[PDB]
Motif scaffolding. Structure first.
Motif, PDB file in Angstrom:
ATOM      1  N   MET A 275      10.654  11.100  -9.924  1.00  0.00           N
ATOM      2  CA  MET A 275      10.339  12.558  -9.580  1.00  0.00           C
ATOM      3  C   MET A 275       9.773  13.052  -8.195  1.00  0.00           C
ATOM      4  SD  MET A 275       8.135  15.610 -11.411  1.00  0.00           S
ATOM      5  CE  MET A 275       8.501  15.383 -13.137  1.00  0.00           C
ATOM      6  N   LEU A 276       8.992  12.215  -7.414  1.00  0.00           N
ATOM      7  CA  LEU A 276       8.781  12.434  -6.248  1.00  0.00           C
ATOM      8  C   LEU A 276      10.053  12.273  -5.087  1.00  0.00           C
ATOM      9  CD1 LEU A 276       6.670  12.548  -3.745  1.00  0.00           C
ATOM     10  CD2 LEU A 276       6.613   9.944  -3.747  1.00  0.00           C
ATOM     11  N   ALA A 277      11.096  11.407  -5.616  1.00  0.00           N
ATOM     12  CA  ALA A 277      12.489  11.348  -4.842  1.00  0.00           C
ATOM     13  C   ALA A 277      13.186  12.646  -4.968  1.00  0.00           C
ATOM     14  CB  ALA A 277      12.970  10.306  -5.420  1.00  0.00           C
TER      15      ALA A 277
ATOM     16  N   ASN B  12       6.145  15.300   7.102  1.00  0.00           N
ATOM     17  CA  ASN B  12       6.791  14.537   8.502  1.00  0.00           C
ATOM     18  C   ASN B  12       6.821  13.165   8.022  1.00  0.00           C
ATOM     19  OD1 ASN B  12       8.257  15.906  10.740  1.00  0.00           O
ATOM     20  ND2 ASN B  12       7.603  13.960  11.305  1.00  0.00           N
ATOM     21  N   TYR B  13       5.832  12.774   7.796  1.00  0.00           N
ATOM     22  CA  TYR B  13       5.498  11.204   7.647  1.00  0.00           C
ATOM     23  C   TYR B  13       6.533  10.702   6.398  1.00  0.00           C
ATOM     24  CZ  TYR B  13       3.252   6.464   7.296  1.00  0.00           C
ATOM     25  OH  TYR B  13       3.178   5.130   7.063  1.00  0.00           O
ATOM     26  N   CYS B  14       6.236  11.331   5.385  1.00  0.00           N
ATOM     27  CA  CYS B  14       6.850  11.207   3.934  1.00  0.00           C
ATOM     28  C   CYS B  14       8.477  11.297   4.155  1.00  0.00           C
ATOM     29  CB  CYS B  14       6.300  12.152   3.069  1.00  0.00           C
ATOM     30  SG  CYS B  14       6.699  11.940   1.348  1.00  0.00           S
ATOM     31  N   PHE B  15       8.871  12.139   4.814  1.00  0.00           N
ATOM     32  CA  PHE B  15      10.438  12.430   4.878  1.00  0.00           C
ATOM     33  C   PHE B  15      10.824  11.416   5.795  1.00  0.00           C
ATOM     34  CE2 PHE B  15      10.124  17.458   4.148  1.00  0.00           C
ATOM     35  CZ  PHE B  15       9.817  17.220   3.146  1.00  0.00           C
TER      36      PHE B  15
ATOM     37  N   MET C 244       3.547   5.533  -5.808  1.00  0.00           N
ATOM     38  CA  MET C 244       3.629   5.584  -7.035  1.00  0.00           C
ATOM     39  C   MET C 244       2.509   6.432  -7.543  1.00  0.00           C
ATOM     40  SD  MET C 244       6.379   4.028  -8.019  1.00  0.00           S
ATOM     41  CE  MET C 244       7.515   3.271  -7.039  1.00  0.00           C
ATOM     42  N   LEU C 245       1.207   6.468  -7.119  1.00  0.00           N
ATOM     43  CA  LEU C 245       0.180   7.267  -7.442  1.00  0.00           C
ATOM     44  C   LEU C 245       0.447   8.518  -7.224  1.00  0.00           C
ATOM     45  CD1 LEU C 245      -2.948   7.533  -8.551  1.00  0.00           C
ATOM     46  CD2 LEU C 245      -3.603   7.111  -5.838  1.00  0.00           C
ATOM     47  N   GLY C 246       0.996   8.771  -6.012  1.00  0.00           N
ATOM     48  CA  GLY C 246       1.501  10.178  -5.441  1.00  0.00           C
ATOM     49  C   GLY C 246       2.569  10.727  -6.592  1.00  0.00           C
TER      50      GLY C 246
ATOM     51  N   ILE D 243       0.869  -1.341   0.000  1.00  0.00           N
ATOM     52  CA  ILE D 243       0.149  -0.007  -0.069  1.00  0.00           C
ATOM     53  C   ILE D 243       0.873   1.105  -0.024  1.00  0.00           C
ATOM     54  CG2 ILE D 243      -1.898   1.398   0.951  1.00  0.00           C
ATOM     55  CD1 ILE D 243      -3.596  -1.062   1.401  1.00  0.00           C
ATOM     56  N   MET D 244       2.123   1.255   0.748  1.00  0.00           N
ATOM     57  CA  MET D 244       2.847   2.411   0.887  1.00  0.00           C
ATOM     58  C   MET D 244       3.457   2.626  -0.590  1.00  0.00           C
ATOM     59  SD  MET D 244       3.690   2.684   4.623  1.00  0.00           S
ATOM     60  CE  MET D 244       5.256   2.693   5.097  1.00  0.00           C
ATOM     61  N   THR D 245       3.968   1.806  -1.176  1.00  0.00           N
ATOM     62  CA  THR D 245       4.470   1.635  -2.329  1.00  0.00           C
ATOM     63  C   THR D 245       3.447   2.200  -3.516  1.00  0.00           C
ATOM     64  OG1 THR D 245       6.496   0.126  -1.719  1.00  0.00           O
ATOM     65  CG2 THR D 245       6.060   0.515  -4.274  1.00  0.00           C
TER      66      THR D 245
ATOM     67  N   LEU E 126      -1.576  20.456  -2.648  1.00  0.00           N
ATOM     68  CA  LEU E 126      -2.568  19.925  -3.970  1.00  0.00           C
ATOM     69  C   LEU E 126      -3.042  18.505  -3.756  1.00  0.00           C
ATOM     70  CD1 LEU E 126      -0.440  21.932  -6.874  1.00  0.00           C
ATOM     71  CD2 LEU E 126      -2.268  22.817  -5.347  1.00  0.00           C
ATOM     72  N   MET E 127      -2.078  17.708  -3.475  1.00  0.00           N
ATOM     73  CA  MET E 127      -2.556  16.317  -3.331  1.00  0.00           C
ATOM     74  C   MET E 127      -3.509  15.904  -2.084  1.00  0.00           C
ATOM     75  SD  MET E 127       0.049  13.059  -3.681  1.00  0.00           S
ATOM     76  CE  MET E 127       1.295  14.236  -4.433  1.00  0.00           C
ATOM     77  N   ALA E 128      -3.063  16.713  -0.872  1.00  0.00           N
ATOM     78  CA  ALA E 128      -4.034  16.502   0.294  1.00  0.00           C
ATOM     79  C   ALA E 128      -5.430  16.943   0.234  1.00  0.00           C
ATOM     80  CB  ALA E 128      -3.246  17.001   1.340  1.00  0.00           C
ATOM     81  N   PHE E 129      -5.679  18.303  -0.506  1.00  0.00           N
ATOM     82  CA  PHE E 129      -6.766  18.987  -0.740  1.00  0.00           C
ATOM     83  C   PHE E 129      -7.694  18.055  -1.691  1.00  0.00           C
ATOM     84  CE2 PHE E 129      -9.590  22.725  -1.836  1.00  0.00           C
ATOM     85  CZ  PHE E 129      -9.998  23.028  -0.673  1.00  0.00           C
TER      86      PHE E 129
ATOM     87  N   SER F 208      12.713   0.624   3.486  1.00  0.00           N
ATOM     88  CA  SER F 208      13.052   0.648   2.055  1.00  0.00           C
ATOM     89  C   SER F 208      11.726   0.508   1.258  1.00  0.00           C
ATOM     90  CB  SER F 208      14.181   0.002   1.413  1.00  0.00           C
ATOM     91  OG  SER F 208      13.874  -1.535   1.303  1.00  0.00           O
ATOM     92  N   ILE F 209      10.710   1.668   1.340  1.00  0.00           N
ATOM     93  CA  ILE F 209       9.488   1.470   0.655  1.00  0.00           C
ATOM     94  C   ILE F 209      10.055   2.317  -0.800  1.00  0.00           C
ATOM     95  CG2 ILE F 209       7.211   2.838   0.526  1.00  0.00           C
ATOM     96  CD1 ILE F 209       7.187   0.461   2.605  1.00  0.00           C
ATOM     97  N   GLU F 210       9.543   1.912  -1.844  1.00  0.00           N
ATOM     98  CA  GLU F 210      10.052   2.519  -3.239  1.00  0.00           C
ATOM     99  C   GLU F 210       9.189   3.661  -3.406  1.00  0.00           C
ATOM    100  OE1 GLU F 210      12.207   2.477  -5.043  1.00  0.00           O
ATOM    101  OE2 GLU F 210      13.289   0.441  -4.352  1.00  0.00           O
TER     102      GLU F 210
HETATM  103  C1  LIG Z   1       2.943  11.646  -1.676  1.00  0.00           C
HETATM  104  C2  LIG Z   1       1.671  10.531  -1.632  1.00  0.00           C
HETATM  105  C3  LIG Z   1       1.207  10.470  -0.572  1.00  0.00           C
HETATM  106  C4  LIG Z   1      -0.430  10.441  -0.298  1.00  0.00           C
HETATM  107  C5  LIG Z   1      -1.213  10.363  -1.261  1.00  0.00           C
HETATM  108  C6  LIG Z   1      -0.969   9.343  -2.400  1.00  0.00           C
HETATM  109  C7  LIG Z   1      -1.695   9.284  -3.509  1.00  0.00           C
HETATM  110  C8  LIG Z   1      -2.941  10.196  -3.716  1.00  0.00           C
HETATM  111  C9  LIG Z   1      -2.871  11.163  -2.836  1.00  0.00           C
HETATM  112  C10 LIG Z   1      -2.222  11.007  -1.395  1.00  0.00           C
HETATM  113  O1  LIG Z   1      -2.709  12.225  -0.781  1.00  0.00           O
HETATM  114  C11 LIG Z   1      -1.665  12.552   0.405  1.00  0.00           C
HETATM  115  C12 LIG Z   1      -1.860  11.459   1.485  1.00  0.00           C
HETATM  116  C13 LIG Z   1      -2.312  11.569   2.402  1.00  0.00           C
HETATM  117  C14 LIG Z   1      -2.212  10.409   3.124  1.00  0.00           C
HETATM  118  C15 LIG Z   1      -1.598   9.037   2.943  1.00  0.00           C
HETATM  119  C16 LIG Z   1      -0.882   9.025   1.869  1.00  0.00           C
HETATM  120  O2  LIG Z   1      -0.107   8.174   1.390  1.00  0.00           O
HETATM  121  C17 LIG Z   1       0.252   7.481   2.444  1.00  0.00           C
HETATM  122  C18 LIG Z   1      -0.993  10.498   0.882  1.00  0.00           C
HETATM  123  C19 LIG Z   1       1.878  10.460   0.718  1.00  0.00           C
HETATM  124  C20 LIG Z   1       1.741  11.087   1.906  1.00  0.00           C
HETATM  125  C21 LIG Z   1       2.611  10.965   2.906  1.00  0.00           C
HETATM  126  C22 LIG Z   1       3.780  10.050   2.650  1.00  0.00           C
HETATM  127  C23 LIG Z   1       3.636   9.286   1.637  1.00  0.00           C
HETATM  128  N1  LIG Z   1       4.575   7.968   1.498  1.00  0.00           N
HETATM  129  S1  LIG Z   1       5.183   7.211   2.657  1.00  0.00           S
HETATM  130  C24 LIG Z   1       3.863   6.202   2.689  1.00  0.00           C
HETATM  131  O3  LIG Z   1       6.297   6.150   2.099  1.00  0.00           O
HETATM  132  O4  LIG Z   1       5.587   7.693   3.767  1.00  0.00           O
HETATM  133  C25 LIG Z   1       2.674   9.456   0.586  1.00  0.00           C
END
Ligand SMILES: CC/C(=C1\c2ccccc2OCc2cccc(OC)c21)c1cccc(NS(C)(=O)=O)c1
Ligand SMILES: CC/C(=C1\c2ccccc2OCc2cccc(OC)c21)c1cccc(NS(C)(=O)=O)c1
Ligand SMILES: CC/C(=C1\c2ccccc2OCc2cccc(OC)c21)c1cccc(NS(C)(=O)=O)c1
Ligand SMILES: CC/C(=C1\c2ccccc2OCc2cccc(OC)c21)c1cccc(NS(C)(=O)=O)c1
Lengths: 244, 10, 244, 10
Positions: C219-221, C201-204, C40-42, C34-36, C78-81, C213-215
């Motif tokens: 471009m996100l990288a 913060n969670y993403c970083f 990828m969708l992100g 699910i993370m990967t 943009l993504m969260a909204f 080692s989640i992929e």
């Molecule tokens: C950048 C894509 C992303 C999310 C995401 C992904 C696809 C579509 C909409 C999204 O909205 C933000 C959103 C909100 C909540 C959770 C999300 O993915 C976990 C996403 C996200 C946010 C935080 C962390 C991570 N990556 S991780 C899991 O390896 O730490 C991804």
């Protein structure tokens, strides 16, 4: 009197269609994870192979387009042969050493396509073991695998390519020095065309399957996209040490 | 192709 | 008399170190998948957001570096909204509509970090539902989110940026036409700084965790790599509609 | 950065 929100009409026009994740719950997580991880490691290996090839004596001397061509045709040869080598060097029966932290047991492979690919790889490993291929012979054979396929009409630096390939064949004969051994190792190089053809077929199948939607890293994806037509165009000419 | 090219051109 | 295999010495020198797959069996397959898939969708969403922004009136008029800056700072806004919007539009309690084929139920989230992120997102969704935000208001608010953060020392096209941002604020007020509503929607825009800060913060954290080692797609990288220092440099200035 | 740049420059 009444101001219209004119830009909202343009914001509506430019709003893109919703993206699909590609997620199919029918595919098990274990399956999706190993395939995805293998493609990711695979992509990183092509990068390593490109940096390796830029360092091979003679390679940089060919035209940039020929270097491009040779790498696009041979990436699977380099990867499969190095996998056979690392698995042979591990000595365990039926283990495929994709990486020091990813040692797959073919006897745990539930996915039939992956099971079939692994069995061919076990033949490569089994052959290096039977012949007790030394590291020096392996390095020569790996370089020859970079020079095993050419385009139907040949390369831009054909004369130089032939000179360089000839040099590496001679290098292999020296590292061994019985001629018999040479015939057997060059016969093993020849048999890699068949192995790789099965690996590319499974790879091309998965790459196009939009239902499974297994992830591929960007550079592996471009090389697969450029190659698929050629694997049907009849544009690849395989170089054989022996008939036929 | 493109990613391979800029890796080769480096 | 005796020919030495001179090139094999150079083949040895250039042979690269073995690559690691990054595979850790302690992380469950469901989790990793699910993370990967979300990353990828992100990644694909950031691409969509870049093509969307190039089509926003006024946006192309700013300096290329400012366009670059605004996109690097706002991608998570943009993504969260948009995620909050698609989840609100689905109407189901506790469902996060990442994509039409990836509707996550927060009540099935076993991974605590992911559970926490999802709950914040449910607050965004809950707020759009409480206020009954129309599609027109949403489009305006989304554009404002692209213009919500600037660098500490400002942009190269500051005057023009301020003119463009002002235009979109006015656009939001027109689409609604009660002033009260404006205060509430601009207050919701303001609260997104906090939401995104938790998501980044969670993403970083995940991006740097070499054990999991989640992929992450290429471009996100790159965007994460460029941003991490800034999120610690104190180089980001948040634009607030209201105090404080 | 680089991937973003060539997408923006398109
Ligand atoms: C950048 C894509 C992303 C999310 C995401 C992904 C696809 C579509 C909409 C999204 O909205 C933000 C959103 C909100 C909540 C959770 C999300 O993915 C976990 C996403 C996200 C946010 C935080 C962390 C991570 N990556 S991780 C899991 O390896 O730490 C991804
Ligand atoms: C001259 C090319 C040759 C062999 C050969 C061919 C290519 C590279 C290395 C070789 O080493 C000797 C070698 C070793 C084993 C098999 C070979 O070809 C089958 C070759 C050969 C061909 C026919 C007969 C024989 N002699 S024998 C007594 O072994 O039957 C050798
Ligand atoms: C390109 C990387 C790859 C393999 C691979 C991966 C990492 C290290 C060595 C490898 O050797 C080839 C090799 C040999 C057998 C199996 C492999 O991965 C399944 C690999 C491969 C081969 C065929 C298909 C696919 N991709 S898929 C699974 O989506 O169809 C990947
Ligand atoms: C002039 C700026 C203002 C409000 C305001 C501020 C920004 C954007 C839109 C607004 O709409 C009116 C609005 C609506 C609700 C709340 C507001 O600020 C709290 C504002 C305001 C400030 C103090 C008092 C009042 N009046 S009242 C009777 O609602 O207490 C309004």
């Amino acid at each position: 009197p009444q101001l219209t929100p004119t830009l909202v009409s343009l914001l509506e026009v430019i709003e893109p269609e919703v993206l699909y994740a590609g997620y199919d719950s029918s595919v098990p997580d274990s399956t999706w994870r190993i395939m995805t991880t293998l493609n990711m490691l695979g992509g990183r290996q092509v990068i390593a192979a490109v940096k390796w090839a830029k360092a091979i004596p003679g390679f940089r001397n060919l035209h940039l387009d020929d270097q491009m061509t040779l790498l696009q045709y041979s990436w699977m040869y380099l990867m499969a042969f190095a996998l056979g080598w690392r698995s042979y060097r591990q000595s365990s029966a039926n283990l495929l050493c994709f990486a020091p932290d990813l040692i797959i047991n073919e006897q745990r492979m539930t996915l039939p396509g992956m099971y079939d690919q692994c069995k061919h790889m076990l033949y490569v490993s089994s052959e290096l073991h039977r012949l007790q291929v030394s590291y020096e012979e392996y390095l020569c054979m790996k370089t020859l695998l970079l020079l095993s396929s050419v385009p139907k009409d040949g390369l831009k630096s054909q004369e130089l390519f032939d000179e360089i390939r000839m040099t590496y064949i001679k290098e292999l004969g020296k590292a061994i020095v019985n001629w018999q051994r040479f015939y057997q190792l060059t016969k093993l190089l020849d048999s890699m065309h068949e192995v790789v053809e099965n690996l590319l077929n499974y790879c091309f199948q998965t790459f196009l399957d939009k239902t499974m939607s297994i992830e591929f890293p960007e550079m592996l994806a471009e090389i697969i996209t450029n190659q698929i037509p050629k694997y049907s165009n009849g544009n690849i000419k395989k170089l054989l040490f022996h008939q036929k | 192709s493109s990613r391979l090219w800029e890796l080769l051109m480096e």
